[PDB]
Enzyme design. Structure first.
Site, PDB file in Angstrom:
ATOM      1  N   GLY B 147       0.829  -1.190   0.000  1.00 13.11           N
ATOM      2  CA  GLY B 147       0.000   0.000   0.000  1.00 13.11           C
ATOM      3  C   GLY B 147       0.867   1.244   0.000  1.00 13.11           C
ATOM      4  O   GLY B 147       0.741   2.098  -0.874  1.00 13.11           O
ATOM      5  N   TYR B 153       9.095   3.556   3.108  1.00 16.53           N
ATOM      6  CA  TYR B 153       9.952   2.469   3.565  1.00 16.53           C
ATOM      7  C   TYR B 153      11.416   2.779   3.291  1.00 16.53           C
ATOM      8  O   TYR B 153      12.275   1.901   3.369  1.00 16.53           O
ATOM      9  CB  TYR B 153       9.556   1.151   2.901  1.00 16.53           C
ATOM     10  CG  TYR B 153       8.138   0.732   3.209  1.00 16.53           C
ATOM     11  CD1 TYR B 153       7.795   0.242   4.462  1.00 16.53           C
ATOM     12  CD2 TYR B 153       7.144   0.829   2.248  1.00 16.53           C
ATOM     13  CE1 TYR B 153       6.502  -0.139   4.747  1.00 16.53           C
ATOM     14  CE2 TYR B 153       5.849   0.452   2.523  1.00 16.53           C
ATOM     15  CZ  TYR B 153       5.533  -0.031   3.773  1.00 16.53           C
ATOM     16  OH  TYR B 153       4.240  -0.410   4.049  1.00 16.53           O
ATOM     17  N   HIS B 159       8.023   4.562   8.153  1.00 12.20           N
ATOM     18  CA  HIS B 159       7.921   3.144   8.469  1.00 12.20           C
ATOM     19  C   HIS B 159       9.285   2.536   8.759  1.00 12.20           C
ATOM     20  O   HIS B 159       9.445   1.789   9.723  1.00 12.20           O
ATOM     21  CB  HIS B 159       7.231   2.397   7.328  1.00 12.20           C
ATOM     22  CG  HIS B 159       5.765   2.667   7.235  1.00 12.20           C
ATOM     23  ND1 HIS B 159       5.042   3.227   8.268  1.00 12.20           N
ATOM     24  CD2 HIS B 159       4.877   2.457   6.231  1.00 12.20           C
ATOM     25  CE1 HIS B 159       3.779   3.347   7.907  1.00 12.20           C
ATOM     26  NE2 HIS B 159       3.652   2.887   6.674  1.00 12.20           N
TER      27      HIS B 159
HETATM   28  C1  LIG Z   1      -4.733  -6.872   6.540  1.00  8.03           C
HETATM   29  C2  LIG Z   1      -3.922  -5.945   5.677  1.00  8.03           C
HETATM   30  C3  LIG Z   1      -2.660  -5.527   6.085  1.00  8.03           C
HETATM   31  C4  LIG Z   1      -1.920  -4.669   5.279  1.00  8.03           C
HETATM   32  N1  LIG Z   1      -0.693  -4.260   5.671  1.00  8.03           N
HETATM   33  C5  LIG Z   1       0.037  -3.429   4.898  1.00  8.03           C
HETATM   34  C6  LIG Z   1       1.386  -2.967   5.300  1.00  8.03           C
HETATM   35  O1  LIG Z   1       1.883  -3.346   6.382  1.00  8.03           O
HETATM   36  N2  LIG Z   1       2.052  -2.141   4.482  1.00  8.03           N
HETATM   37  C7  LIG Z   1       1.534  -1.723   3.312  1.00  8.03           C
HETATM   38  O2  LIG Z   1       2.214  -0.951   2.600  1.00  8.03           O
HETATM   39  N3  LIG Z   1       0.304  -2.104   2.873  1.00  8.03           N
HETATM   40  C8  LIG Z   1      -0.472  -2.933   3.601  1.00  8.03           C
HETATM   41  N4  LIG Z   1      -1.742  -3.337   3.164  1.00  8.03           N
HETATM   42  C9  LIG Z   1      -2.283  -2.870   1.887  1.00  8.03           C
HETATM   43  C10 LIG Z   1      -1.874  -3.832   0.780  1.00  8.03           C
HETATM   44  O3  LIG Z   1      -0.455  -3.775   0.595  1.00  8.03           O
HETATM   45  C11 LIG Z   1      -2.578  -3.476  -0.522  1.00  8.03           C
HETATM   46  O4  LIG Z   1      -3.992  -3.489  -0.314  1.00  8.03           O
HETATM   47  C12 LIG Z   1      -2.231  -4.477  -1.611  1.00  8.03           C
HETATM   48  O5  LIG Z   1      -0.849  -4.349  -1.955  1.00  8.03           O
HETATM   49  C13 LIG Z   1      -3.090  -4.264  -2.848  1.00  8.03           C
HETATM   50  O6  LIG Z   1      -2.688  -5.220  -3.823  1.00  8.03           O
HETATM   51  P1  LIG Z   1      -3.775  -6.140  -4.568  1.00  8.03           P
HETATM   52  O7  LIG Z   1      -3.056  -7.379  -5.040  1.00  8.03           O
HETATM   53  O8  LIG Z   1      -4.993  -6.255  -3.681  1.00  8.03           O
HETATM   54  O9  LIG Z   1      -4.157  -5.304  -5.884  1.00  8.03           O
HETATM   55  P2  LIG Z   1      -5.454  -4.356  -5.949  1.00  8.03           P
HETATM   56  O10 LIG Z   1      -5.323  -3.244  -4.937  1.00  8.03           O
HETATM   57  O11 LIG Z   1      -6.688  -5.229  -5.953  1.00  8.03           O
HETATM   58  O12 LIG Z   1      -5.284  -3.715  -7.410  1.00  8.03           O
HETATM   59  C14 LIG Z   1      -5.186  -2.302  -7.550  1.00  8.03           C
HETATM   60  C15 LIG Z   1      -5.667  -1.913  -8.937  1.00  8.03           C
HETATM   61  O13 LIG Z   1      -5.000  -2.698  -9.928  1.00  8.03           O
HETATM   62  C16 LIG Z   1      -5.933  -2.989 -10.968  1.00  8.03           C
HETATM   63  N5  LIG Z   1      -5.604  -4.235 -11.698  1.00  8.03           N
HETATM   64  C17 LIG Z   1      -5.839  -5.494 -11.284  1.00  8.03           C
HETATM   65  N6  LIG Z   1      -5.425  -6.394 -12.214  1.00  8.03           N
HETATM   66  C18 LIG Z   1      -4.920  -5.705 -13.253  1.00  8.03           C
HETATM   67  C19 LIG Z   1      -4.312  -6.032 -14.563  1.00  8.03           C
HETATM   68  N7  LIG Z   1      -4.155  -7.315 -14.965  1.00  8.03           N
HETATM   69  N8  LIG Z   1      -3.918  -5.005 -15.348  1.00  8.03           N
HETATM   70  C20 LIG Z   1      -4.066  -3.724 -14.967  1.00  8.03           C
HETATM   71  N9  LIG Z   1      -4.608  -3.353 -13.793  1.00  8.03           N
HETATM   72  C21 LIG Z   1      -5.049  -4.283 -12.910  1.00  8.03           C
HETATM   73  C22 LIG Z   1      -7.286  -3.099 -10.290  1.00  8.03           C
HETATM   74  O14 LIG Z   1      -8.333  -2.657 -11.160  1.00  8.03           O
HETATM   75  C23 LIG Z   1      -7.157  -2.187  -9.086  1.00  8.03           C
HETATM   76  O15 LIG Z   1      -7.861  -0.961  -9.307  1.00  8.03           O
HETATM   77  C24 LIG Z   1      -2.488  -4.203   3.982  1.00  8.03           C
HETATM   78  C25 LIG Z   1      -3.747  -4.622   3.579  1.00  8.03           C
HETATM   79  C26 LIG Z   1      -4.480  -5.476   4.385  1.00  8.03           C
HETATM   80  C27 LIG Z   1      -5.845  -5.929   3.949  1.00  8.03           C
HETATM   81  N1  LIG Z   2      -4.438  -0.298   2.100  1.00  7.41           N
HETATM   82  C1  LIG Z   2      -3.605   0.862   1.982  1.00  7.41           C
HETATM   83  C2  LIG Z   2      -3.805   1.748   0.939  1.00  7.41           C
HETATM   84  S1  LIG Z   2      -5.085   1.421  -0.230  1.00  7.41           S
HETATM   85  O1  LIG Z   2      -4.660   1.964  -1.576  1.00  7.41           O
HETATM   86  O2  LIG Z   2      -5.296  -0.070  -0.335  1.00  7.41           O
HETATM   87  O3  LIG Z   2      -6.369   2.083   0.209  1.00  7.41           O
HETATM   88  C3  LIG Z   2      -3.020   2.868   0.810  1.00  7.41           C
HETATM   89  C4  LIG Z   2      -2.002   3.132   1.707  1.00  7.41           C
HETATM   90  N2  LIG Z   2      -1.157   4.292   1.629  1.00  7.41           N
HETATM   91  C5  LIG Z   2      -0.615   4.910   0.422  1.00  7.41           C
HETATM   92  C6  LIG Z   2      -0.969   4.520  -0.866  1.00  7.41           C
HETATM   93  C7  LIG Z   2      -0.405   5.155  -1.985  1.00  7.41           C
HETATM   94  C8  LIG Z   2       0.511   6.192  -1.840  1.00  7.41           C
HETATM   95  N3  LIG Z   2       1.032   6.766  -3.078  1.00  7.41           N
HETATM   96  C9  LIG Z   2       1.387   8.147  -3.303  1.00  7.41           C
HETATM   97  N4  LIG Z   2       0.567   9.152  -2.967  1.00  7.41           N
HETATM   98  C10 LIG Z   2       0.949  10.430  -3.190  1.00  7.41           C
HETATM   99 CL1  LIG Z   2      -0.097  11.756  -2.757  1.00  7.41          CL
HETATM  100  N5  LIG Z   2       2.147  10.694  -3.757  1.00  7.41           N
HETATM  101  C11 LIG Z   2       2.958   9.689  -4.099  1.00  7.41           C
HETATM  102  N6  LIG Z   2       4.240   9.972  -4.691  1.00  7.41           N
HETATM  103  C12 LIG Z   2       5.268   8.962  -4.666  1.00  7.41           C
HETATM  104  C13 LIG Z   2       5.365   8.072  -5.725  1.00  7.41           C
HETATM  105  C14 LIG Z   2       6.351   7.089  -5.714  1.00  7.41           C
HETATM  106  C15 LIG Z   2       7.242   6.987  -4.649  1.00  7.41           C
HETATM  107  C16 LIG Z   2       7.143   7.876  -3.590  1.00  7.41           C
HETATM  108  C17 LIG Z   2       6.161   8.865  -3.592  1.00  7.41           C
HETATM  109  S2  LIG Z   2       6.089   9.967  -2.206  1.00  7.41           S
HETATM  110  O4  LIG Z   2       4.815  10.783  -2.208  1.00  7.41           O
HETATM  111  O5  LIG Z   2       6.154   9.123  -0.958  1.00  7.41           O
HETATM  112  O6  LIG Z   2       7.270  10.908  -2.245  1.00  7.41           O
HETATM  113  N7  LIG Z   2       2.584   8.415  -3.870  1.00  7.41           N
HETATM  114  C18 LIG Z   2       0.879   6.590  -0.539  1.00  7.41           C
HETATM  115  S3  LIG Z   2       2.039   7.888  -0.182  1.00  7.41           S
HETATM  116  O7  LIG Z   2       2.536   7.718   1.234  1.00  7.41           O
HETATM  117  O8  LIG Z   2       3.225   7.824  -1.107  1.00  7.41           O
HETATM  118  O9  LIG Z   2       1.366   9.232  -0.317  1.00  7.41           O
HETATM  119  C19 LIG Z   2       0.308   5.944   0.572  1.00  7.41           C
HETATM  120  C20 LIG Z   2      -1.782   2.245   2.790  1.00  7.41           C
HETATM  121  C21 LIG Z   2      -2.588   1.108   2.916  1.00  7.41           C
HETATM  122  C22 LIG Z   2      -2.391   0.220   3.962  1.00  7.41           C
HETATM  123  O10 LIG Z   2      -3.102  -0.758   4.058  1.00  7.41           O
HETATM  124  C23 LIG Z   2      -1.393   0.444   4.898  1.00  7.41           C
HETATM  125  C24 LIG Z   2      -1.201  -0.451   5.944  1.00  7.41           C
HETATM  126  C25 LIG Z   2      -0.205  -0.221   6.871  1.00  7.41           C
HETATM  127  C26 LIG Z   2       0.599   0.892   6.762  1.00  7.41           C
HETATM  128  C27 LIG Z   2       0.422   1.792   5.729  1.00  7.41           C
HETATM  129  C28 LIG Z   2      -0.579   1.574   4.786  1.00  7.41           C
HETATM  130  C29 LIG Z   2      -0.772   2.474   3.730  1.00  7.41           C
HETATM  131  O11 LIG Z   2      -0.060   3.455   3.643  1.00  7.41           O
END
Ligand SMILES: Cc1cc2nc3c(=O)[nH]c(=O)nc-3n(C[C@H](O)[C@H](O)[C@H](O)COP(=O)(O)OP(=O)(O)OC[C@H]3O[C@@H](n4cnc5c(N)ncnc54)[C@H](O)[C@@H]3O)c2cc1C
Ligand SMILES: Nc1c(S(=O)(=O)O)cc(Nc2ccc(Nc3nc(Cl)nc(Nc4ccccc4S(=O)(=O)O)n3)c(S(=O)(=O)O)c2)c2c1C(=O)c1ccccc1C2=O
Ligand SMILES: Cc1cc2nc3c(=O)[nH]c(=O)nc-3n(C[C@H](O)[C@H](O)[C@H](O)COP(=O)(O)OP(=O)(O)OC[C@H]3O[C@@H](n4cnc5c(N)ncnc54)[C@H](O)[C@@H]3O)c2cc1C
Ligand SMILES: Nc1c(S(=O)(=O)O)cc(Nc2ccc(Nc3nc(Cl)nc(Nc4ccccc4S(=O)(=O)O)n3)c(S(=O)(=O)O)c2)c2c1C(=O)c1ccccc1C2=O
Lengths: 270, 271
Positions: B147, B153, B159
């Protein structure tokens, strides 16, 4: 004062069960209201699914768990076994995680406990994470038993620094949600501990819980030093980056900054 | 050559599933025997119990999984699911773990996969571990979609270093059983990545797999530098400890020795 004990072991004859029950007797004598959560006994399901949501899904086609889970919490549409656990999370002042070390981390059943119960908005928020997390006025401990000794997890060991292993659990899971992590209770090679020495460990654990709430917790880098916006990338402030460049040691294990890591930063208090 | 792919996502419509399918077809393209392990689709049981032993228990009174699971394997009293997965391991030359980062680690179903499949005498042994591990001929890779972003990271991220988050999985689990860990395939900030950008990630991933057997694996302190003895407590040899005294860097993340950690030790290959 209320406390919650979470135990991830299948057997009653386990030293983890004994370590659990010891915590109960010790805290209850101090006037604590202690509830337990034997994950195995409850037949707890650690696997997240769309069934975790008992309400109408926002998008049954493309299901995204972190999206439907947050919405369901605000509307009270989470699974009844998850809500039951969450009630105990808020009502509890102290949280104790009792488990055997399993492949350098928590057992699956505990990992899945985190995943299903720590729902967004409930446990965490990006507008209030770590130092501002919902569980600020709460302290968490780790009571772990390993098969390997302490020398194997020393800096000069074969497995590596145990401090490194505890970091993605105490920082990224516990502290992330506001928790104050206290000094972990480490039990190295419990399978190889003499019978009358095991009995002593239970006592050192029970004596500890007599004055555990007034202990000094582990040190984490406060988020007061980070930008905390999505455009800066949640990076550190340059006012601090220039300050931490004259130092020898890093802030923490993950916040080491390519320099020396503070001795027992994840096991010993600061 | 054979490859095994272990997918850990509940959703068929997930990018992790796309990343799995694209990895499959890319390998089959180069004449790879590809086997898959869709945990959710396989309804895989991720919880360890005495139910894992189909035969007669050595001690149903005082039951201990580690010491009782080794036995079942030797005599052949392991659950069919566990054995069916243990065979896919031994057969394959390359193992790929496709999953979303969940709470700074792997999903429980994947963690449970490790706990039930990786059994003593098979996956590991006190005599045969790490450099001398049973799976010393095989290679493993992590394919992760997070995410958060790469900056979150980063070293100065809120983080913390991804290398620290990846260490207990790559060193403590993969390498411990003998594996050669390759450079993890990190996909940050998924969900904030455009459609045309997501189609390119798949192709780049499919391209890397073309010559992925000829890549350099991640560095781990060789077991030769340690005294594999219980009297020595598996410590670093004093001969080696006196060599790493005048240095200002450790050997890895877990072997930092209270010194500095080599840059990108768990993401970028040696040198
Ligand atoms: C319990 C839990 C714990 C978590 N902990 C963390 C954490 O510690 N750190 C962190 O960073 N994140 C965390 N997350 C968030 C998690 O990392 C993201 O939700 C996850 O990486 C999303 O990947 P996904 O495989 O579900 O793809 P999705 O989010 O389902 O896909 C995103 C987009 O890709 C598109 N897509 C799908 N297939 C294709 C294709 N073939 N071609 C083009 N586009 C496509 C879809 O339309 C969708 O809009 C957590 C989530 C949960 C539920
Ligand atoms: N599920 C999510 C999601 S979601 O997309 O699935 O709704 C989203 C999501 N956060 C999350 C998702 C996407 C971005 N991407 C994002 N956004 C902006 Cl406004 N700018 C950029 N630029 C950017 C692009 C590439 C590299 C670095 C950057 S930088 O902004 O960090 O300088 N990236 C960013 S951001 O920090 O970079 O702003 C946080 C998280 C999580 C988590 O589950 C989660 C769990 C534990 C810890 C953290 C998270 C988490 O952060
Ligand atoms: C899947 C898996 C992965 C693992 N990964 C790791 C790893 O990465 N690293 C690692 O170091 N270890 C690992 N282990 C081993 C694990 O850490 C140990 O098995 C565990 O720490 C000890 O088990 P237990 O706490 O249930 O105690 P048990 O082994 O059940 O009991 C230990 C001893 O305590 C005694 N005892 C029980 N009750 C009492 C009492 N009331 N009073 C006094 N004595 C008592 C018993 O006689 C017994 O001999 C793993 C094990 C498994 C199954
Ligand atoms: N179950 C264990 C155990 S056990 O105590 O429960 O048997 C123990 C255990 N570690 C672990 C394994 C063996 C020993 N010691 C051990 N082992 C053997 Cl096979 N023989 C000898 N005898 C021996 C032989 C020669 C010289 C000296 C000796 S000594 O008895 O005096 O130590 N010692 C010791 S120590 O405490 O004595 O240092 C810890 C592990 C595990 C694991 O399950 C496990 C799972 C995944 C990864 C790692 C492990 C793991 O490491």
């Amino acid at each position: 004062r209320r406390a919650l004990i979470v135990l991830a072991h299948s057997e009653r004859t386990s030293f983890n069960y004994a370590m659990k029950e010891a915590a109960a007797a010790a805290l209850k004598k101090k006037g604590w209201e202690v509830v337990e959560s034997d994950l195995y006994a409850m037949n707890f399901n650690p696997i997240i699914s769309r069934k975790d949501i008992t309400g109408k899904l926002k998008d049954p086609a493309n299901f995204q768990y972190p999206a439907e889970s947050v919405l369901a919490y605000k509307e009270g549409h989470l699974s009844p076994d998850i809500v039951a656990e969450q009630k105990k999370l808020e009502a509890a002042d102290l949280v104790i995680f009792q488990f055997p070390l399993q492949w350098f981390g928590v057992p699956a059943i505990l990992k899945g406990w985190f995943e299903r119960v720590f729902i967004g908005e409930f446990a965490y928020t990006y507008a209030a994470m770590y130092d501002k997390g919902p569980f600020r006025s709460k302290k968490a401990v780790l009571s772990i038993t390993t098969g390997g000794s302490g020398s194997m997890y020393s800096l000069q060991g074969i497995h590596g620094d145990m401090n490194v292993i505890l970091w993605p659990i105490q920082s990224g899971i516990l502290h992330f949600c506001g928790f104050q992590v206290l000094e972990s209770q480490l039990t190295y090679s419990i399978g190889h501990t003499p019978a009358d020495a095991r009995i002593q460990i239970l006592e050192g654990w029970k004596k500890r819980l007599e004055n555990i709430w007034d202990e000094t917790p582990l040190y984490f880098a406060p988020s007061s030093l980070f930008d905390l916006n999505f455009q800066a990338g949640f990076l550190m402030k340059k006012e601090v980056q220039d300050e931490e460049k004259n130092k020898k040691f890093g802030l923490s294990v993950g916040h080491h900054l390519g320099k020396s890591i503070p001795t027992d930063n994840q096991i010993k208090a600061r």
